[PDB]
Design a protein around this ligand. Structure first.
Ligand SMILES: C=C(c1ccccc1)[C@@H](N)P(=O)(O)O
Ligand SMILES: C=C(c1ccccc1)[C@@H](N)P(=O)(O)O
Lengths: 674, 674
């Protein structure tokens, strides 16, 4: 039926990406990660990788013990029968013609010469301790399947190091994917003299102190034949970090879908761009899901529903966002499956097949799935950030943001409030560096190790660059999300002040215009209805702003059509202009300032419509739970001070819950075509 | 004084880039290229490379004959003394341990196994015949210095092939820089059975036919010891093409400087951005020259001088263009010097030093100067095109082009004329592909030829990508230059129609406004002076366009300040509005149409100010000599039809003369700081 396992691979790509993310989040928060060599998820690797006191613990399946012992015993019995085994009685790699009977000394030597990394002083050349934990977890998962020929006791010791947050120090570079950095795990286990570890609070430990604080009894391990090679001959570091990167990339792809919808909300975009017919007719599932998610947010938007009771299309960053995000999500999802197979693979060599009484030589250490998926994922991250840069740019440009202030300036005086202009330049710098990062790593392969390794994956180098790309995407997402919340509040200010202007224009009209000028009150209010508040509200009665000009234009046009009644000063509309303009100038500025002051005090005449929006949890989280403040030149607070709050919260995973809550009433299908 | 030749290298970088270009152009057009191994310029290589009947001929310096014979004789005498010489009695490259006494068969075999390229059918895998000519010229120049040990007769035969435009067919790929493609020159010379050549009209020739049409007498050459290796062991193909690319890149850099100034002219930019103080204070000579060149054009601009007799700063694509272009010009100039040294180098191995009675083994075949200069030059080409894309985008956007029509639309009805919108999308596609091409080639080095060639330059691959970049820059320059000429004509239309509107508004004012409304004629004309013609001229009396609205606003504001005189209908300014508006509506549309029709017939009321501009030669060349037409929706002609004229002319070098003429009165210094 499925002898090459294509079909079981296809099965994992069914169901929505969002449900996959919901499962990942639930898996991440489980208190125990039980390893049995076969069920490791990127969410479990991400959970173990954290060094933030979540309390997650690792436990080893007792079901693997028998297979582990069988291959360990097999190798030891092979050593005693005098047989010639690669990596056991022979040299390594291109020098495998050398032979020896000192199996123990051979493995000791293996770790010694693989300790060829460089740390220097400080931490710049050190693998992040979170990544080292991920690699430890993943190495255990490989060795547990019973094909590697290493004692279960060593796996238990690595488990204690994880559960006590005692982490060996690994070099950042030195691997083409992972012998050298993995040798620094083995060196801790053998107590090498240069081996160092870091405790939970950051203190450097000797191997002795580390064993002590981890509760590993029995002294340092003396590696038995093949045991050094089983520890080092795998892709655990590259795939470990790729899991951490993919966990965050998946969640950020959902954040990008939702923020594209909040973007549409505050831009007053046409929700038609999410119509299921459009996306159904292209078949791409990423684009169909993306449209449906944004459709869900917009179908529960108080802005859209308000507009319904009262340019045919938007620019690409809004209208084509489902077409744009769709394929990036498919890449991230497909890359995730590839990494999940890699972290559950037997990446080791040779393999001990006790059932056939032999060792199988092969290339499962070749981390191509990591290189390929990380290269492809990094390009997709860059495409997500380029869209986010385009959206941000639209949002802060008054040419394109449908009446929002230039720069999303917040204060009363636009000459002393340039809003997000600095943040916008920084968004360009983020986006540019992201497009550089989008270049591949895996097309830079050198013929290595005396040309024995004449192809090699560069997996971990690629994972490291995708991790950098993810951090930049977080800087962009933070900056965008705070911009969106500012725009939300500006729409709130806009609708309240617009009501005040309309009430004042009407009341002054009903006074000074009684004779036949009564007819033009409807036209004067229409001037207010159609004019952009932020084009004039900082100085509403200024003669050079559009409100006074167009009100006066309305009075003039009514007088010109007023006929012979215009010839009698008693019924002349033109003769009412200066009275009207004086009366409005006398009352409108204070009415506007009062309503604004009432809004700033929490007493708006019209409540903030975000509160009735499916997108409310993200706004509430940013503005109310984190206390991120509305940004104004009338205060000293910088945009960066507020970015910090969201960025630190995003990096602690606190965005996940409000992100998912905005979608929790979605049934996973697009709306009927209406 | 200068024992490492840094100082003589520094000397070549003095004087202006423009004077260097002027010399290059004069050198290109000389009727004879005399090679003596030491004076080859990129302009001579470009001139020889052409297959367009310019009649340029190659002649060999008789002064080199003695050195050539001496090393040829030396090698033959070495062969007869039984001595062991690399490439003469030994195998090649990584297999140099093999030995033989059949020197002739060794060189025959060398050409045979180096004929390892692939052509297929058609021309896609064939080196362009212009590049093959460049490589032939450059190979002669290396061998003429007397260090290679090859007969002068063979150089004379290649000279005949050049002077009769008989060109051997070379494969496009196969070289890491140039044994394989150079072996197809040697194969023609030895009459190999697969060897093919192309005549002047394109007919494929056998080696026999080629020798016949070239007038090479004496039959095919039988290579003597070392002669095959001297033919193939050089960088001639990479450096040959790099010369052709650099010749055009230098001229296009001057076109970019000048077009940046014409851009400023039609944008009504502030010529202050070229002020010498600004650029002097940065020391960069490329930026100082660039500013001074643009300053020269602007100081002789009738637009600027007109504006003088009657926003403080421009956007970056205009204001920072000298800062942007400066370093690209320095890179192109420095790369040119590197290639000129390479095409005059003894790139061969081993070298025969008769003066010391020995062969010198070395690495002069290592084409790093080509790879490095082409990689650096390609990045600079991309930066020039990115600026040109930014400038074009500004020019066709009515938000930023200071009153020019959106899309530079040309016709009477903007709803049926979308101008350069298609060209603008194509400019984005050019710019994007250019930014891709900007990636380096020389960071993709493979350890080659059984790891004997474990570093290699990839020079020719880089030259090929820079050549592609140059072609794209030509597509952008063509499209930009035709856009600039359209804008020039639109400023001509703008000033003529604006005069017509002002005359009509004045004459109707002086009639229907005589009572005290005489005072507002000055304000009404000011409305015309300050309003953008193209914001209303397609329908000048439309009530929704700014002209009628603001004229009416002027009459209303004068009536409001007219006081008690406004209360008597005899002296009421408001009572004059509908008369004025009716009178203007009756006369202005036909006055405008008449003046426009008079302009289209060559009878403008105001001549085209381009005629008094230092930039006039480029406009005259494009619009009048090439017959490139003003683009309008009222005709069937496409922008591409007009692009063709300029692109084909640009590729024939016909842009050079008008380009240089626009600068011919420049003394090479910036203006005094005033
Ligand atoms: C080449 C290898 C190696 C190199 C250095 C030390 C230990 C092993 C192993 N990847 P293998 O291909 O399994 O022999
Ligand atoms: C390695 C070389 C070679 C390879 C194939 C054919 C002929 C020569 C020469 N570049 P060289 O380094 O001069 O020996």
């Amino acid at each position: 039926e499925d002898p090459l396992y294509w079909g079981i691979a296809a099965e994992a790509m069914t169901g929505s990406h969002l449900d996959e993310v919901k499962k990942m989040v639930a898996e991440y928060r489980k208190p125990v990660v039980k390893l049995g060599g076969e069920t490791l998820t990127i969410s479990q690797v991400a959970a173990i990788s954290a060094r933030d006191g979540s309390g997650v613990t690792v436990e080893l399946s007792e079901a693997a013990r028998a297979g582990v012992k069988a291959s360990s015993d097999w190798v030891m019995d092979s050593m005693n029968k005098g047989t010639d085994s690669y990596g056991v009685t022979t040299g390594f790699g291109a020098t495998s013609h050398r032979r020896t009977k000192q199996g123990g000394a051979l493995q000791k030597e293996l770790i010694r010469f693989l300790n060829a990394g460089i740390f220097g002083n400080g931490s710049d050349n050190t693998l992040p301790h979170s990544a080292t934990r991920a690699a430890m977890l993943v190495r255990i998962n490989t060795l547990l399947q019973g094909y590697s020929g290493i004692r279960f006791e060593i796996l238990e010791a690595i488990t204690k190091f994880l559960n006590q947050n005692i982490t060996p120090c690994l070099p950042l570079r030195g691997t083409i994917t992972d012998l050298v950095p993995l040798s620094y795990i083995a060196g801790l286990l053998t107590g090498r003299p240069n081996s160092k570890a870091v405790g939970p609070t950051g203190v450097i430990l000797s191997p002795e102190e580390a064993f002590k604080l981890a509760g590993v009894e029995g002294g340092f391990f003396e590696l038995q034949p093949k045991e050094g090679l089983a520890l080092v001959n795998g892709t655990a570091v590259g795939s470990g970090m790729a899991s951490m990167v993919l966990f965050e990339a998946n969640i950020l792809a959902v954040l990008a879908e939702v923020m594209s919808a909040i973007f549409a909300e505050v831009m007053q975009g046409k929700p038609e761009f999410t119509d299921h017919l459009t996306h159904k007719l292209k078949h791409h599932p990423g684009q169909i899901e993306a449209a449906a998610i944004m459709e869900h947010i917009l179908d529960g938007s108080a802005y859209v529903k308000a507009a319904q009771k009262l340019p045919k299309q938007d620019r690409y960053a809004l209208r084509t966002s489902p077409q744009w995000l769709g394929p990036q999500i498919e890449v991230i999802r497909s890359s995730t499956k590839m990494i999940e197979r890699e972290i559950n693979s037997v990446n080791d060599n040779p393999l001990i097949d006790v059932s056939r009484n032999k060792a199988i030589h092969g290339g499962n250490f070749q981390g191509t799935p990591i290189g390929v998926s990380m290269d492809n994922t990094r390009l997709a991250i860059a495409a997500i950030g380029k869209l986010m840069f385009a959206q941000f740019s639209e949002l802060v440009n008054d040419f394109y943001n449908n009446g929002l202030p230039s720069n999303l300036s917040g204060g009363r005086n636009p000459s002393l409030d340039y809003g997000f202009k600095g943040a916008e330049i920084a968004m360009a710098s983020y986006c540019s560096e992201l497009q550089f990062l989008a270049n591949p790593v895996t097309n830079h392969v050198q013929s290595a190790e005396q040309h024995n390794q004449d192809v090699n994956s560069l997996g971990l180098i690629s994972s490291r660059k995708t991790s950098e790309a993810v951090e930049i995407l977080k800087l962009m997402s933070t900056t965008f999300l705070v911009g969106l919340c500012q725009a939300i509040d500006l729409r709130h200010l806009e609708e309240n002040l617009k009501s005040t202007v309309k009430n004042t224009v009407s009341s002054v009209a009903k006074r000074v215009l009684t004779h036949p000028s009564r007819f033009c009150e409807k036209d004067l209010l229409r001037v207010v209805d159609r004019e952009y508040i932020f084009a004039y509200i900082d100085d509403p009665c200024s003669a050079t702003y559009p409100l006074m000009q167009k009100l006066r234009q309305t009075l003039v046009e009514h007088a010109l059509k007023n006929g012979d009644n215009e010839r009698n000063l008693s019924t002349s509309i033109f003769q009412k202009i200066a009275t009207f303009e004086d009366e409005l100038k006398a009352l409108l500025p204070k009415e506007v300032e009062s309503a604004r002051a009432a809004l700033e005090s929490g007493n708006p005449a019209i409540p903030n419509r975000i509160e009735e929006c499916r997108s409310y949890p993200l706004y509430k989280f940013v503005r109310k739970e984190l206390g991120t403040e509305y940004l104004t030149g009338e205060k000293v607070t910088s945009p960066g001070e507020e970015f910090e709050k969201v960025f630190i919260a995003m990096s602690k995973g606190e965005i996940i819950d409000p992100l998912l809550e905005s979608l929790e009433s979605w049934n996973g299908a697009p709306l009927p075509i209406s």
